[PDB]
Amino acid sequence: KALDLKDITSGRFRPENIQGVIPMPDGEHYTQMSADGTQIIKYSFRTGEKVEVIFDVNQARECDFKNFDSYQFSPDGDKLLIATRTTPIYRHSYTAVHYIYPLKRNDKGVTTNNIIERLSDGGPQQVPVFSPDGTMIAFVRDNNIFLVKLLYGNSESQVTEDGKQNSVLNGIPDWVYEEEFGFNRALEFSADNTMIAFIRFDESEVPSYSFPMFAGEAPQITPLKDYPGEYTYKYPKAGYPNSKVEVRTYDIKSHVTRTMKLPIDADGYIPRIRFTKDASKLAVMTLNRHQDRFDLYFADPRSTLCKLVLRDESPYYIKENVFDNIKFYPETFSLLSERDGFSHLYWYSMGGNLIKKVTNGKYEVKDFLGYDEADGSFYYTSNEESPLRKAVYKIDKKGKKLKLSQREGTNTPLFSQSMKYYMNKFSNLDTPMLVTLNDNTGKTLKTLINNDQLKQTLSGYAIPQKEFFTFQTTDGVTLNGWMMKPANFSTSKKYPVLMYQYSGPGSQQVLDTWGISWETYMASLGYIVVCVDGRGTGGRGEAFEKCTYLKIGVKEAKDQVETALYLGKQPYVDKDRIGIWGWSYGGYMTLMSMSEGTPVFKAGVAVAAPTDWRFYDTIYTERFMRTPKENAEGYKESSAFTRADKLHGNLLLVHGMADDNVHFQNCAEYAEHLVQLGKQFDMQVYTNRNHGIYGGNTRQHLYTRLTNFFLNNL
Amino acid sequence: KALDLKDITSGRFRPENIQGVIPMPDGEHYTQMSADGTQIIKYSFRTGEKVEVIFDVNQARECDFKNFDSYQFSPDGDKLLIATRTTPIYRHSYTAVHYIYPLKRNDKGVTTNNIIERLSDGGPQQVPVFSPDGTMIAFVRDNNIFLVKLLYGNSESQVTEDGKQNSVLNGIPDWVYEEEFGFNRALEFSADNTMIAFIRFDESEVPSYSFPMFAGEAPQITPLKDYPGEYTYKYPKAGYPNSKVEVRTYDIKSHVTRTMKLPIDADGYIPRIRFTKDASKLAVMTLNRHQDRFDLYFADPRSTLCKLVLRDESPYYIKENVFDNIKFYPETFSLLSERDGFSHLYWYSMGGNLIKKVTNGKYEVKDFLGYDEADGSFYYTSNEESPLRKAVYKIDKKGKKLKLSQREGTNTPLFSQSMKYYMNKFSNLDTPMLVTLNDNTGKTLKTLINNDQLKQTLSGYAIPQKEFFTFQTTDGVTLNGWMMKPANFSTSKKYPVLMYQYSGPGSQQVLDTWGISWETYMASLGYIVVCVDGRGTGGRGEAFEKCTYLKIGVKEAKDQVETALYLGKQPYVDKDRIGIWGWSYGGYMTLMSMSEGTPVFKAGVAVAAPTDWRFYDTIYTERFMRTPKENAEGYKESSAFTRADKLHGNLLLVHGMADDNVHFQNCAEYAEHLVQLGKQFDMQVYTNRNHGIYGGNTRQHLYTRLTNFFLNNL
Numbered sequence A, B: 001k002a003l004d005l006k007d008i009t010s011g012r013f014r015p016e017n018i019q020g021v022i023p024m025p026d027g028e029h030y031t032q033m034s035a036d037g038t039q040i041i042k043y044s045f046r047t048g049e050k051v052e053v054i055f056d057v058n059q060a061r062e063c064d065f066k067n068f069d070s071y072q073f074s075p076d077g078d079k080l081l082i083a084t085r086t087t088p089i090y091r092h093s094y095t096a097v098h099y100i101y102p103l104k105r106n107d108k109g110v111t112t113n114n115i116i117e118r119l120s121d122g123g124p125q126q127v128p129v130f131s132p133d134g135t136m137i138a139f140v141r142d143n144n145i146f147l148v149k150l151l152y153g154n155s156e157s158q159v160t161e162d163g164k165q166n167s168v169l170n171g172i173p174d175w176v177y178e179e180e181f182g183f184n185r186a187l188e189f190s191a192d193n194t195m196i197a198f199i200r201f202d203e204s205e206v207p208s209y210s211f212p213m214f215a216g217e218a219p220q221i222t223p224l225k226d227y228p229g230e231y232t233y234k235y236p237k238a239g240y241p242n243s244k245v246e247v248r249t250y251d252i253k254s255h256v257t258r259t260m261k262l263p264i265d266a267d268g269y270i271p272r273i274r275f276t277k278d279a280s281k282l283a284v285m286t287l288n289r290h291q292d293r294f295d296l297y298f299a300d301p302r303s304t305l306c307k308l309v310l311r312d313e314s315p316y317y318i319k320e321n322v323f324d325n326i327k328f329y330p331e332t333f334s335l336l337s338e339r340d341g342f343s344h345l346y347w348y349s350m351g352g353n354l355i356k357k358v359t360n361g362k363y364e365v366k367d368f369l370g371y372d373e374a375d376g377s378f379y380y381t382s383n384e385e386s387p388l389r390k391a392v393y394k395i396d397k398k399g400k401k402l403k404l405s406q407r408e409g410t411n412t413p414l415f416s417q418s419m420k421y422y423m424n425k426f427s428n429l430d431t432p433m434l435v436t437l438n439d440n441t442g443k444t445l446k447t448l449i450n451n452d453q454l455k456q457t458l459s460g461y462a463i464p465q466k467e468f469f470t471f472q473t474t475d476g477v478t479l480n481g482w483m484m485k486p487a488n489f490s491t492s493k494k495y496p497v498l499m500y501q502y503s504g505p506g507s508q509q510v511l512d513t514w515g516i517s518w519e520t521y522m523a524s525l526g527y528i529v530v531c532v533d534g535r536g537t538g539g540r541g542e543a544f545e546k547c548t549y550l551k552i553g554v555k556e557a558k559d560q561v562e563t564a565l566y567l568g569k570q571p572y573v574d575k576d577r578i579g580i581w582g583w584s585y586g587g588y589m590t591l592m593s594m595s596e597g598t599p600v601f602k603a604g605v606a607v608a609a610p611t612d613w614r615f616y617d618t619i620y621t622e623r624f625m626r627t628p629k630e631n632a633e634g635y636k637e638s639s640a641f642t643r644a645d646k647l648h649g650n651l652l653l654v655h656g657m658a659d660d661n662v663h664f665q666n667c668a669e670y671a672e673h674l675v676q677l678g679k680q681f682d683m684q685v686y687t688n689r690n691h692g693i694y695g696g697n698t699r700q701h702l703y704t705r706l707t708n709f710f711l712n713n714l
């Protein structure tokens, strides 16, 4: 009956789901890895049937490993690139040891008895990518680009020789690009398999940041058992210099390198490079440093000449979302733009002239899934039904629209190569996970996972239920939230409240989807738990989110206080016992709200909080606030330091000391400012821990601390 | 009527005392620094009379400063060396700008209108030392020795060339020597003013250690306002290499440098050098790495030859207190030795023959004050009366012993240049501070200070009273301690208990001397506060102190546990409500006691605490434990890590992150192990703070947190 935190932090209630699902190039099958990690099995999109195991560790020849982590197909589906020994660097980048496995069928009718081959004789590799004809793979190692010709007995050549750690990176983004522009690779083949193009990052003039490493446990870093070590990398703080970037091309046949004559600002960005279906046109997406002039260029890989193709200006800032929704077809490309105050899908010609605006209306397109070149149709995801919901929609050449999703809540799709079939994951507040196959009309072909077992297990526990709600601020805005009530609820009783939030620009934590979390536990202990996404939050247009431009956190704090006051109006809430917490931007938000000047909170917890935006990185910070030189007062009014003396309530700072995102510096400096103000607070710092704050019993330790802190300060 | 914590932390109740009393060469007078530090004034030992003002900032000529911090008289009495702009480095080293003030009476007959002179036209100087005749001064700057000839224009010469930071130190100890042998100088003139001797420390192959520095506040480290920086220094953890040391002599007339041919162990120590009354005998004191063999060598500054004069072997270790109690007379020198199980005074010929053991008994001689060569009288200090007490004693040429100290308590003496008079600073639990002037025989000639108006101020508040007691552990050992009860105590009521302790090898906290501390405030808040010195502590002989050898902490934790059980038996104590606290070893002893096994402590605070001796430095740690390799089992049995699973009570860890003595690494690693064990606990980390944890509001902040933790955990 009773909910145990250990089961939660353990992931005991984690819904079953298929992992490692990769669409085959055929358009009719998908593959998934086995639970063991010993096999890649090919299943069918139309029926869900298993077809055969295409790869097996205990069946290959020359296969030394016995587990692999991930894999991709060659464009035509006869080779596999299988990744082993995957080792994280940052959130998106990793090294791995890759093997090429051919899928030819042998004299017994199977594909599983073939000879594995190594991608490279040297050390582990990064971001390997097939050429369009499947005959070549480029990867990056030690900040240099290497090319393997598979038609030449995997002949390896070195395409770049300038890379150095903390100086020059070839093909892979630096730290801040990788995190805030969302990518791990800037390395492309041309349509005709004759050129390679890549971004080159001179980061040598970027500041260096370092933090201590100890031995710690889980993992224990044994060489540091007596004397500590450190981590050193380039990380540009707000207003400081970013990497100098250039786009270069390598003529495979002639071994020649060229530098595209790209007329961008000295301090500009080059978030992506993507080769088009034109082998003589390479798309280069550029931003100005204000990040509000998206300039898409087409560059000629030989002439080095670049022609401006499109510009999307915003009165605020372009968002990273947009770049990867730009898919290139033989005659056209796609684009996601908020130019009309909402995220919508524009269809453009390869000459730069608009063709069609495919969507419109007061709602947000979230993803562009693809364009079916057979029936003229567009497939995308959207929140048209509710901001809290996501569904899958089709629009045909004639402009008729059809909602493919069959249930209401959150729908996440994965289409086949041909776009004939797709695999849907559905969830909502009551449905943990419904995985199905579906056709292009959305008709259900088969239910793959339905999670009977989890529900039955849950049916024996007293789980508090979330219900959405809405309320109106004092100046007239309607905000969405959810409330979880303890299981013997009674509006004659008076309850404490824990508010959770994130509140970061463009984010949403109030969604019609399913989770049991630490907040579920708190409610099972007798706490009303609320969450309200306020101003600056996503899903409701550019206006709702970008009201915070140049002065962030202020309006978010005012709406968190608004939520506290609305709840204090309810007869069943005890206004002297509201607490607030959050993580990342949310920890910042706990700070801002608790020191907003209106003394409505009794306790709060700030986990890995930025405290003054001059400590955080260029791309994210500047997108919203500009440089400190240009926006001094905004920095002043957006800083937790400025309003610290008005802090009211008891605080718990929680930070990991090996946080390479929000630096521990934030916590150190803010804590010292609170010590000089004379404010009493509490601390919990975790050794060798990152932004995630995980490792062994770390998370159970952490959530037990939060539970104790709020039980004691109420 | 109510004691305030701000008055404790701001030193409102500090007893009045005298500064800078330096006996003059006359044998009849002393000099002291004026209250405001603008005047150096002469006084008579016999009458207490102000005789004249030697120096006055307001009267001196061409004097740019308005304040000074210290002064050193010339051996002849001709000149004064004034120290201004005193800037600490570590705990005993510092740089200051020094001035030579001539002391010649004018036409008016006064010595207060002469032109002050700079010692060096260059930069700040360290440990400046006079030559016996007073015509020369040696000092250190930038790790190099400099000589100034006063007879010849105050001319400066450079004795040494190879000083490099973090590599070669000349005349000054490296970090660990300064801290654990307790000295700041290794730089001396021969008796005939012809030679300089010094220790040359080569610390190049000593491990570097480093920790982050932020901007902080009070002081704010301004260049670190965006990017942190670091502090780096040499620091060998236990069993790592120490400095390569060697003695050197510089010929003042011929500029020749020689190195003494000294048969010391490759891993041995030279804790001190000292010139004797014979100009051709330099005494070098040497230890082995086990610090259990003390070897006194006499060395020829010109032949480089070295003759072993003395060998003192201890079964445990030699204590530091011997080194500075070796005083050289024309035919004899002094020595303190624990050979007899107690610290006693031995009188040796300058040929190495023992002449006599001057003291005997079951008591310890703490300091050797001197020898009156006129009447063959010895003067020293001792706890003969009680381990809690300290008194001045005389022993004449026939062996008659006479306690000089009139009152019982703690008596601290300062003698005249002739041993014919001495100033006495007396205190005990009921007496804040008596400063008197006394004679050879011990009579009180005058009472300079009685600290009456402090007794006045205090009467107005309810100050809890300390009182001593003893108790017997379950194995017959009797322990000394004090108990402080709240000014409204009733045997009818049950009270909660706060135990303070330090417990480090050789130390005493239960002493008959006066203080108002944080513990006094807790007592005024309703706590019975107890301090108990347990096994391992000083005052009672080598057997009782050094029973902990090779396995530290275990028996000290046992006796704190016994203290808790004994208090729990008392009819007026709530045994479910007892707490423990400490700083340094004291914090380590908080740790060890709270995880001893017998779960008696409800709460506890550990400030700046060590947690595994493999983290701590070479000299201190190896003195009691030897190296981690030789004593692995002892290191494992003494680790706070090894017993961490048995930790009981709520614990607060408090550390300064810039702690250069107990590295914050101790805190990080111990906290991590407690996380992986699932032990909840609290943290308070102080930014940019060292072992003493101070600056701006810091202390007022720290002690408030400690108050609340104990109020909240009872």
Ligand SMILES: COc1cc2c(cc1OC)[C@@H](Cc1ccc(Oc3cc(C[C@@H]4c5cc(OC)c(OC)cc5CCN4C)ccc3OC)cc1)N(C)CC2
Binding pocket: A091, A502, A504, A507, A583, A584, A585, A661, A691, A692, A693
């Ligand atoms: C919803 O809040 C967040 C939203 C957003 C962000 C971070 C957030 O909060 C850290 C960041 C992106 C970002 C995401 C994760 C990040 O570092 C980690 C954080 C956690 C904490 C783990 C978690 C994990 C996530 O996925 C990896 C996540 O995705 C948005 C959110 C959260 C939060 C809760 N949970 C406690 C675990 C592992 C991590 O790296 C291995 C560092 C940065 N951008 C601003 C995008 C929107």
Ligand SMILES: COc1cc2c(cc1OC)[C@@H](Cc1ccc(Oc3cc(C[C@@H]4c5cc(OC)c(OC)cc5CCN4C)ccc3OC)cc1)N(C)CC2
Binding pocket: B091, B502, B504, B507, B583, B584, B661, B691, B692, B693
């Ligand atoms: C009984 O305790 C101690 C004894 C002993 C030690 C340290 C102790 O306790 C930190 C160390 C010597 C030592 C002394 C001080 C040190 O760092 C500082 C600590 C404090 C804290 C200030 C304090 C100050 C002292 O003198 C300076 C002191 O001497 C007995 C004890 C204490 C206590 C706390 N009080 C709150 C203030 C300033 C400091 O450096 C400028 C670092 C090391 N050696 C092993 C000798 C015996």
